[PDB]
Design a protein around this nucleic acid. Structure first.
Ligand SMILES: OC[C@H]1O[C@@](CO)(O[C@H]2O[C@H](CO)[C@@H](O)[C@H](O)[C@H]2O)[C@@H](O)[C@@H]1O
Length: 580
DNA sequence: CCTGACTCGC
DNA sequence: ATGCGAGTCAGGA
C-alpha cells in the first residue's frame, strides 16, 4: 500500500517544474521562528522528499520558491510562508491553498489537516497529522522514513484534490472568493503576523504591580465581608459563601447548580456589599492573568514584539480569529483595562499608531441587504441610528427621546442583528416577555423591509439549505429543519445573522487587500498591524499621518458599493490607547 | 488532558 | 435560550 517517492539527497531540475504540490512542514502549532522538519514536492515528474537543511541551502530551490511564475498548490500556505520569512526566504506563486478551499466549501467541517480535507472527496490515502505526530505531551516528529511518507502522501493528496475542489468552488460561484479574496489576504496576514506589534513591557510590569496591589485590597475586603477566606475563583466555593453563609437570594442557576455569573451578581449587589467587591475582583483578575501575565509570556525577549497568529479558516461566518496572543480582545470598555493599550506602541522611533474603524457596518449592511427605505434613509442622513429607532418604536420626537429610551432602542437594534427573541430581549433589557415582544412588533412596523428580510432569509435557508454573504461565502444550516424548537430556533438566528456578520467580514477583508495595494503604489512605509473585525490598526512614520488620514478612510469606504454609504472614523497617537 | 464558568472583544 | 470568537482557572479524568 506504500507510496513510491524519491528520498532525494540533492535538489534536481525535475523538482523545479512550473507546477507542483508543495509541503513545507512545520509541526509546532505556533509556527513563528519554528523549525521546518521536511519538504515534499509532487509534480509531473514524480514525488520527492527533501531534507530542509539541503533544500533551503540550495540557491536553485530557494529561487524556485520565490518565483511567482512557478505555481504551487499547498495546504495552509500562510504557515509555510511565515516560517520561511523567519529564515529570510520568500514564498511566492501559491495559486491554490486546500485549507482555504476546504474552508469556503464548508466552514462547519473544521478542516485542520490535509486528511480531513481529502475526506470531503472520499480520498483516504493520507493519514491525519495527529495520528502521525501525536498531540500534547506525546507530540513529536517521527523518524525520517515515517515522516517522509506522510509528507509525500499529503503532497500527493493536494496534487489530486486541487481540480475537484476548484470545480465545486466554481459551481458554488466561490472561485473568485478563493483566488481574489482569501488567498491574497493570506499573504497580507502573513506579513502582518511576521512584522508583529511592539510591546512596552516595562509599562506592562508597572501595571502588573499596581493591579497586584489592588487585587490584594479587594481580596482582603472580600474575606472580611464574608468573615472567612476562600477561593473567589471557585464557582463552587463562591456559591456556598454567597447563597449559604450570607443567605443571599437565589434567582438564577447554571447547568450544574449555583449561578455566580455577572448577570446574577449585578442583581444581588443591592443585598450585600460583598457582591460589588466580587465583581471588581473579577475585573482586575482578568486584566492581571490574561493581559499582564498572559501577554508577558508571549512577548519575544529579543524584539519585545508579540506575533499573533490569525486563523483564517475557523469562524463559521468568515471572520478572522486571533491567537497566542488574542489581539482582538484587548480591553477598552472599562478605563482600568483600556490602559492596557498604552503598552502597544510603534515598532520604530517617530512612528505612530493609526486606527480606522467602520461605524455601524452591520446595521448598514442590514439596510443594504433588506433594502429597508426607513433604515437606508436614516444612514443617508447619517443619523444616530439608536435615537432614530427610539423615535420610531416610541413614536416621539428627537427631543422626547430619554437616555433610557435610547439604551433600549440600542439593545433592540443589536438584538435584531443577532436574531434576538422576545425572551432574550427580555433577559437583556430585563423586562416582560410580552413587552419585549411588543418592542419587536414596533420595530418591524417602522422597518418592514427588515421584517421581510428576516422572514425571507429563513425560508431561503430552508429551501436551499444554506445562506450566503455579499461575496458568496456560505454557511449550511441543516438544523433549520429540526423538529426540536431550540435547535431549529438557533439555526434560524444563524440564518438571519450570518449574511450580516459575514458580509461585514467580506468587506473589511477586501478593504485590507485594496489598502495594501494602495500603500505600495504610494510607496508609503505604513503597514497593517492588526484587524479587529471592523477596524484596521496600522503603524507609520509621523510624517505619513496626514496622507493616511485621507487614504485609509477612502479605501475602506470604497471597498464595496452599498445602497447606503460606509462610514469610517479614524484616530492616531503614540500608542494604541491614544489612537482614539 | 478535557469540559464548564467566567470575562474579554466586535 | 440575542450572533461570532480566545485565554485562564477550577474541576475531575
Ligand atoms: O496555522 C494556522 C492554521 O492551522 C490550523 C490547523 O491546520 O490550526 C493550528 O494552528 C493554530 C495557530 O497556532 C492553533 O490555534 C490550532 O490549535 C492548530 O491546530 C488551522 O485551524 C489554522 O487555520
Amino acid at each position: 500500500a506504500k507510496m513510491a517517492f524519491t528520498l532525494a539527497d540533492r535538489v534536481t531540475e525535475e523538482m523545479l517544474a512550473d507546477k507542483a504540490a508543495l509541503v513545507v512542514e512545520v509541526v509546532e502549532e505556533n509556527y513563528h521562528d519554528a523549525p521546518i522538519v521536511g519538504i515534499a514536492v509532487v509534480n509531473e515528474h514524480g514525488r520527492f522528499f527533501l531534507r530542509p537543511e539541503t533544500a533551503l541551502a540550495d540557491p536553485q530551490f530557494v529561487a524556485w520558491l520565490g518565483d511567482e511564475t512557478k505555481k504551487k498548490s499547498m495546504f495552509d500556505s500562510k504557515r509555510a510562508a511565515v516560517a520561511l520569512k523567519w529564515k529570510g526566504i520568500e514564498l511566492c506563486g501559491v495559486s491554490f491553498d486546500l485549507l482555504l478551499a476546504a474552508y469556503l466549501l464548508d466552514p462547519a467541517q473544521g478542516v485542520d489537516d490535509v486528511a480531513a480535507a481529502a475526506k470531503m472527496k472520499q480520498y483516504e490515502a493520507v493519514r491525519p497529522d495527529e495520528a502521525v505526530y501525536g498531540k500534547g505531551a506525546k507530540r513529536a516528529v517521527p523518524d525520517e522514513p515515517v515522516l517522509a511518507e506522510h509528507l509525500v502522501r499529503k503532497a500527493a493528496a493536494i496534487w489530486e484534490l486541487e481540480r475537484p475542489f476548484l470545480d465545486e468552488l466554481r459551481r458554488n460561484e466561490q472561485d473568485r472568493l478563493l483566488v481574489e479574496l482569501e488567498q491574497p489576504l493570506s499573504s497580507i496576514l502573513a506579513e502582518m503576523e511576521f512584522a508583529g506589534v511592539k510591546v512596552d513591557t516595562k509599562r506592562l510590569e508597572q501595571m502588573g504591580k499596581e493591579l497586584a496591589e489592588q487585587l490584594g485590597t479587594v481580596e482582603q475586603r472580600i474575606y472580611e465581608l464574608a468573615g472567612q477566606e476562600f477561593n473567589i475563583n471557585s464557582p463552587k466555593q463562591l456559591g456556598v459563601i454567597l447563597f449559604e453563609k450570607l443567605q443571599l437570594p437565589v434567582l438564577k442557576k447554571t447547568k450544574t447548580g449555583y449561578s455566580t455569573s455577572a448577570d446574577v451578581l449585578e442583581k444581588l449587589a443591592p443585598y450585600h456589599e460583598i457582591v460589588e467587591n466580587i465583581l471588581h475582583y473579577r475585573q482586575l483578575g482578568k486584566l492581571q492573568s490574561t493581559y499582564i501575565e498572559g501577554l508577558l509570556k508571549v512577548v519575544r525577549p529579543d524584539t519585545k514584539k508579540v506575533h499573533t497568529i490569525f486563523n483564517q479558516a475557523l469562524t463559521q461566518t468568515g471572520r478572522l480569529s486571533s491567537t497566542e496572543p488574542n489581539l482582538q480582545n484587548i480591553p477598552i470598555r472599562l478605563e482600568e483595562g483600556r490602559k492596557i493599550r498604552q503598552a502597544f506602541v510603534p515598532s520604530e522611533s517617530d512612528w505612530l499608531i493609526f486606527a480606522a474603524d467602520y461605524s455601524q457596518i452591520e446595521l448598514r449592511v442590514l439596510a443594504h441587504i433588506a433594502e429597508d427605505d426607513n433604515l437606508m434613509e436614516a444612514f443617508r442622513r447619517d443619523l444616530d441610528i439608536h435615537t432614530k429607532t427610539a423615535m420610531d418604536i416610541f413614536q416621539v420626537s428627537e427631543d422626547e427621546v430619554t437616555p433610557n429610551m435610547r439604551r433600549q432602542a440600542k439593545a433592540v437594534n443589536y438584538g435584531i442583528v443577532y436574531g434576538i427573541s422576545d425572551y432574550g430581549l427580555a433577559q437583556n433589557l430585563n423586562i416582560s416577555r410580552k413587552e419585549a415582544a411588543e418592542f419587536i412588533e414596533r420595530y418591524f412596523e417602522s422597518f418592514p423591509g427588515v421584517k421581510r428580510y428576516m422572514e425571507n432569509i429563513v425560508q431561503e435557508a430552508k429551501q436551499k439549505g444554506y445562506v450566503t454573504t455579499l461575496l458568496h461565502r456560505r454557511r449550511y444550516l441543516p438544523d433549520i429543519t429540526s423538529r426540536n424548537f431550540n435547535v431549529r430556533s438557533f439555526a434560524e438566528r444563524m440564518a438571519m445573522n450570518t449574511p450580516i456578520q459575514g458580509s461585514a467580514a467580506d468587506i473589511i477583508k477586501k478593504a485590507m487587500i485594496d489598502l495594501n495595494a494602495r500603500l505600495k503604489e504610494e510607496r508609503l512605509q505604513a503597514h497593517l498591524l492588526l484587524q479587529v473585525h471592523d477596524e484596521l490598526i496600522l503603524e507609520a512614520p509621523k510624517e505619513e499621518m496626514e496622507r493616511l488620514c485621507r487614504l485609509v478612510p477612502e479605501v475602506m469606504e470604497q471597498a464595496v458599493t452599498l445602497r447606503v454609504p460606509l462610514k469610517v472614523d479614524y484616530h492616531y497617537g503614540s500608542t494604541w490607547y491614544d489612537a482614539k
